[PDB]
Amino acid sequence: HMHNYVIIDAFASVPLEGNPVAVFFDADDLPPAQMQRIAREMNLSQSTFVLKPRNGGDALIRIFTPVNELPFAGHPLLGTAIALGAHTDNHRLYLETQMGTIAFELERQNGSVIAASMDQPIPTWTALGRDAELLKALGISDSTFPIEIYHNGPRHVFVGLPSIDALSALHPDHRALSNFHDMAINCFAGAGRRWRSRMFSPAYGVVEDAATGSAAGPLAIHLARHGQIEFGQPVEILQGVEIGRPSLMFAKAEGRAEQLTRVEVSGNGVTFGRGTIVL
Amino acid sequence: HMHNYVIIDAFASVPLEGNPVAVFFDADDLPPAQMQRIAREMNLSQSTFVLKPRNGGDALIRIFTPVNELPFAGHPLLGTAIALGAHTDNHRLYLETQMGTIAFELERQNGSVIAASMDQPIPTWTALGRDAELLKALGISDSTFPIEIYHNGPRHVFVGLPSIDALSALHPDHRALSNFHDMAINCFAGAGRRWRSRMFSPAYGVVEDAATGSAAGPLAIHLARHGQIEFGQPVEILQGVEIGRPSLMFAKAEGRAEQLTRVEVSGNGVTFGRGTIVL
Ligand SMILES: CCO[C@@H]1C=CC=C(C(=O)[O-])[C@H]1[NH3+]
Numbered sequence: 393h394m395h396n397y398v399i400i401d402a403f404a405s406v407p408l409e410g411n412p413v414a415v416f417f418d419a420d421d422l423p424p425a426q427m428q429r430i431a432r433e434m435n436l437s438q439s440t441f442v443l444k445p446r447n448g449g450d451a452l453i454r455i456f457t458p459v460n461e462l463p464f465a466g467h468p469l470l471g472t473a474i475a476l477g478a479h480t481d482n483h484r485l486y487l488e489t490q491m492g493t494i495a496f497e498l499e500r501q502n503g504s505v506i507a508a509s510m511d512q513p514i515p516t517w518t519a520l521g522r523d524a525e526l527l528k529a530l531g532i533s534d535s536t537f538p539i540e541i542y543h544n545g546p547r548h549v550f551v552g553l554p555s556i557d558a559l560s561a562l563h564p565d566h567r568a569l570s571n572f573h574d575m576a577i578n579c580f581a582g583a584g585r586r587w588r589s590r591m592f593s594p595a596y597g598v599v600e601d602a603a604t605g606s607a608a609g610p611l612a613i614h615l616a617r618h619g620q621i622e623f624g625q626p627v628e629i630l631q632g633v634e635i636g637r638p639s640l641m642f643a644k645a646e647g648r649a650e651q652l653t654r655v656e657v658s659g660n661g662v663t664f665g666r667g668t669i670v671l
Numbered sequence: 672h673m674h675n676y677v678i679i680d681a682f683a684s685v686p687l688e689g690n691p692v693a694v695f696f697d698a699d700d701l702p703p704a705q706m707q708r709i710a711r712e713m714n715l716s717q718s719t720f721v722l723k724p725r726n727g728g729d730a731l732i733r734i735f736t737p738v739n740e741l742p743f744a745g746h747p748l749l750g751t752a753i754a755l756g757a758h759t760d761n762h763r764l765y766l767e768t769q770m771g772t773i774a775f776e777l778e779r780q781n782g783s784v785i786a787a788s789m790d791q792p793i794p795t796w797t798a799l800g801r802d803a804e805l806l807k808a809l810g811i812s813d814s815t816f817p818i819e820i821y822h823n824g825p826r827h828v829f830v831g832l833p834s835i836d837a838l839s840a841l842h843p844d845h846r847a848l849s850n851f852h853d854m855a856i857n858c859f860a861g862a863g864r865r866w867r868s869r870m871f872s873p874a875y876g877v878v879e880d881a882a883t884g885s886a887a888g889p890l891a892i893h894l895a896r897h898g899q900i901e902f903g904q905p906v907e908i909l910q911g912v913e914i915g916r917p918s919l920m921f922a923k924a925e926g927r928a929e930q931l932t933r934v935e936v937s938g939n940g941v942t943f944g945r946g947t948i949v950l
Pocket residue numbers: 411437464465466467468546596597598601603604605606607
């Protein structure tokens with residue numbers, strides 16, 4: 393009774409950039425309570441567990457924070473797909489989750505998976521309706537674009553800043569942000585294809601997140617809806633620069649606001665470490 | 672350029688109990704900034720790095736949280752000593768730290784180090800002087816014994832409860848506790864040789880700690896000073912039960928309050944995992 397694991401830095405091509413996730417293989421012998429205890433033991437923002445598939449996919453993936461199981465998270469699933477590429481020749485990988493089966497395209501160089509693209513759940517969205525409270529918490533007077541909250545498992549609010557330097561200058565009051573339950577606050581700035589983001593979430597137990605993969609799809613939708621890109625055009629989103637964990641996420645939303653057909657998010661991943669646990 | 676590491680559960684004899692620390696070997700090639708980045712990457716409460724000695728010890732140990740270096744911490748040094756026992760036959764280990772050289776006795780069974788005892792810095796102490804504020808934050812009316820704050824690197828406040836069940840019933844207001852800077856709050860209950868503890872510290876970035884090894888020595892002093900044990904008598908301190916990380920710490924203080932000669936803390940440790948990182 394031992395399990396091998398890898399630590400993947402997701403949305404990075406260099407170790408110690410991007411956002412880490414520990415991926416545990418051959419986890420079918422672990423009861424869920426033990427998966428939870430292991431995720432707590434590692435204390436990474438998420439640990440994932442690779443299980444035999446039950447509905448025709450390649451594998452079933454369970455995602456745990458140190459305190460609870462999650463239905464969906466982008467960077468942990470990206471890292472899981474990249475890690476599993478070391479163990480399959482498949483060009484595509486179908487990972488079963490609580491959101492259904494998530495399709496991944498694996499990208500390789502000489503047998504090593506260096507990147508992947510995923511099709512995300514199509515989000516829903518509406519106005520947050522707490523704008524002055526949120527802006528006060530962030531320390532700014534206004535957003536550029538409408539402050540809207542998106543749902544694809546987790547919930548993501550988007551607040552637009554007028555320049556990248558204004559984004560980097562943010563020093564939010566995290567106590568005030570803690571009154572925004574069950575959501576993450578994503579502040580963004582940029583133009584055209586290239587955007588910068590910073591994510592803050594007391595609700596999700598993070599002062600500032602390096603790479604919020606489940607926010608990248610919704611941000612592409614947000615930018616297309618508010619006229620900064622078209623549906624069908626990709627954006628490059630660079631997150632985590634200010635905290636020294638630069639993370640590059642690519643995202644594209646196809647269709648139109650009223651009839652979205654696909655939400656794609658991709659990025660590189662690199663192995664930081666590999667190990668074995670004693671149970 | 673790779674480094675091996677182990678995850679040791681300190682103050683435990685069973686994996687997933689006690690308090691984890693990652694121990695990185697052969698770290699002399701790592702600049703301190705990189706040690707800090709690695710400790711952040713792992714996100715364990717502490718990671719330690721094993722370096723060549725500079726003042727006649729066996730090794731020099733650097734202790735990092737995800738955000739800063741620490742001069743002293745008990746469970747990380749305990750785990751480091753136990754981990755290093757896999758690589759030496761020595762009965763005693765002298766580990767250089769910012770507090771000076773810390774002497775460890777290693778305890779083995781068939782070549783495996785299963786426990787260790789350390790001589791801790793002798794603490795200083797005084798009344799906290801914020802009793803009503805602290806008791807309000809904890810949700811209780813009074814302490815049994817004087818509320819005093821001890822210093823041996825970190826700072827530890829001790830608040831006594833009238834029964835173990837009263838200790839387990841505590842649900843502190845962690846926002847109110849956050850006004851207690853640069854210290855940990857240790858609540859305790861028990862009798863004779865056997866004590867229970869719970870530690871809370873927003874200042875040290877933990878809602879509730881499993882095993883606060885640097886608090887065990889000061890608690891023995893506290894109990895001897897306030898007449899519950901004698902100087903020279905050991906106590907058993909069980910921490911972390913309520914959070915499912917039961918941790919057993921043993922402590923003894925020799926001398927008298929005005930002239931302490933030794934503060935000893937010991938416990939078991941077990942390997943949870945072993946790995947290698949790519950830099
Ligand atoms: C600790 C915060 O972790 C985030 C929580 C929910 C969604 C994520 C993601 O989608 O990558 C995570 N990055």
